[PDB]
Amino acid sequence: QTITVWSWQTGPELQDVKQIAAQWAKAHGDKVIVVDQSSNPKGFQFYATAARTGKGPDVVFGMPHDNNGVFAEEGLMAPVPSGVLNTGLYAPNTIDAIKVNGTMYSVPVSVQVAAIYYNKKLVPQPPQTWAEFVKDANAHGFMYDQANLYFDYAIIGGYGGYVFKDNNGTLDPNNIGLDTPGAVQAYTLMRDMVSKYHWMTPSTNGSIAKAEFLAGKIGMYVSGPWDTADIEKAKIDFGVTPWPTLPNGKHATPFLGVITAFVNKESKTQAADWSLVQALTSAQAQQMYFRDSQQIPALLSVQRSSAVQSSPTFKAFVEQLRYAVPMPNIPQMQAVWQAMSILQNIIAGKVSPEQGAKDFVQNIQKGIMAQGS
């Protein structure tokens, strides 16, 4: 018979996943099939769509933790069995990220915090203050997936904005802070990056920004370890640096993302599934994933290895970590991602930042109301 694994991580890491699975299979006898879903237009939530109709995989690898709230609530995830996760081997925020309604539903594999990747050919020294940033941006260019909340939240949070109010670990989905005076100021700066700085056009997105950077046309770009391989293949002499402080003198607040692995509740071979998951998420595995893409391991013991401690990716990570905000993992967070398109209207000047902020929050509250039966 066969065990099917769906991976949302591609590139070098995918190859490591396949070799580890092959080795596990030689001992267990089950045939293991790995499918690359990273390019699926349906996105991360495609797992629920498939799992709802009994067409899902047995194991899922490389899923950003925010998505699991939906899967867990709909009963598409098998709870993590006892003895598999030792909460003491990870930072506390990493563990909270995999818990849904108090139950651990997935295993952490890596931790992510977006940073600024720069071309040392154009930008010898990375900017640290907004003043230096404007200087380097006007001179050699800057672009990123500007209307994607995952990335621009760094600015929003920097101005005091927030998605759901955090009350000592408990999120209040009724207290949204995306239309506070601070957020509006953030949206204005986002608008300015196009209308006055002219660093980007209302049309610029992640695809264009990445292509431009790989062609050596722009000096800075906001990204993550998922682009490490493509950058090295383009032989760009790059560096990694945290977001600069914003014009209000505050530090930007990027999201902290935890990449996870989990088991489908419908899978008939759950004992074997978890054994496989343990192999794909072990300390040895995490060392392999770090090798090429520089993916930061979730396990604290591997983070302490000298190879990791000395990498540019880890240095930026450690300097931004205390300012990073873990993405909410509750079901309502999906309503946020889906109402996100409004940001493009604000950036394009179709609506003012004031009104756009209001429309954004209203579309989120509506989407949330839609959820729940």
Ligand X SMILES: OC[C@H]1O[C@H](O[C@H]2[C@H](O)[C@@H](O)[C@@H](O)O[C@@H]2CO)[C@H](O)[C@@H](O)[C@@H]1O
Footprint of ligand X on this chain (CB under 6 A)?
43-44, 64, 66-67, 112, 148, 150, 224, 226, 257, 337
Q: What Cα–Cα distance (Å) separates residue 26 from each residue in 20, 57, 262?
A: 10, 20, 22
C-alpha dihedral over 75, 112, 58, 287, to 10 degrees?
-140
Q: How far is the CB of 224 from ligand X (least distance, A)?
A: 6
**Shorter beta-carbon distance to ligand X: residue 14 or 123:** 14
Q: How far is the CB of 134 from ligand X (least distance, A)?
A: 25
**Cβ atoms of residues 179 and 357 within 8 Å:** yes
**Shorter beta-carbon distance to ligand X: residue 38 or 355:** 38
Return all residues near 268 (Cβ < 8 A) that are at least 6 apart: none
**Shorter beta-carbon distance to ligand X: residue 119 or 334:** 334
Q: How many degrees, rounded to 5, is the angle at CA 102 between CA 97 and CA 107?
A: 45
Beta strands in 102-245 (DSSP E): 103-104, 107-112, 115-119, 142-143, 162-167, 170-177, 220-223, 238-241
Q: How far is the CB of 346 from ligand X (least distance, A)?
A: 16
Angle between helices 270-280 and 12-28 (to 10 degrees): 130
Q: How far is the CB of 226 from ligand X (least distance, A)?
A: 6
**Cβ atoms of residues 203 and 216 within 8 Å:** no
Give the distance from CA 173 to its chain's centroid: 21
**Shorter beta-carbon distance to ligand X: residue 43 or 81:** 43
Q: Which residue is nearest to ligand X (CB)?
A: 64
Q: How far is the CB of 11 from ligand X (least distance, A)?
A: 12
Exposed e or buried b per residue across 56-79, where buried means at least 16 C-beta atoms within 10 angstroms of its C-beta: bbbbbbbbbbbbbbbbbbeebbbe
- Judged by DSSP in three states, 99 sits in strand
Q: What Cα–Cα distance (Å) separates residue 244 from each residue in 148, 155, 163, 369?
A: 19, 10, 22, 37
Q: How far is the CB of 114 from ligand X (least distance, A)?
A: 8
C-alpha dihedral over 311, 317, 318, 321, to 10 degrees?
-170
**Shorter beta-carbon distance to ligand X: residue 127 or 356:** 356
Q: How far is the CB of 95 from ligand X (least distance, A)?
A: 18
Q: How far is the CB of 290 from ligand X (least distance, A)?
A: 15
Strand 162-167 relative to strand 115-119, pairing: unpaired
**Shorter beta-carbon distance to ligand X: residue 260 or 267:** 260
**Shorter beta-carbon distance to ligand X: residue 111 or 288:** 111
**Shorter beta-carbon distance to ligand X: residue 224 or 353:** 224
Q: How far is the CB of 361 from ligand X (least distance, A)?
A: 18
Give the pair of three-digit tokens for residue 100: 């849904």
Fill in the DSSP letter of residue 249.
Answer: S
How far apart CA 20 and CA 26 sit, in angstroms, is: 10
Strand 220-223 relative to strand 142-143, pairing: parallel
**Shorter beta-carbon distance to ligand X: residue 143 or 272:** 143
Q: What is the CA radius of gyration of the chain?
A: 21
Q: How far is the CB of 190 from ligand X (least distance, A)?
A: 15
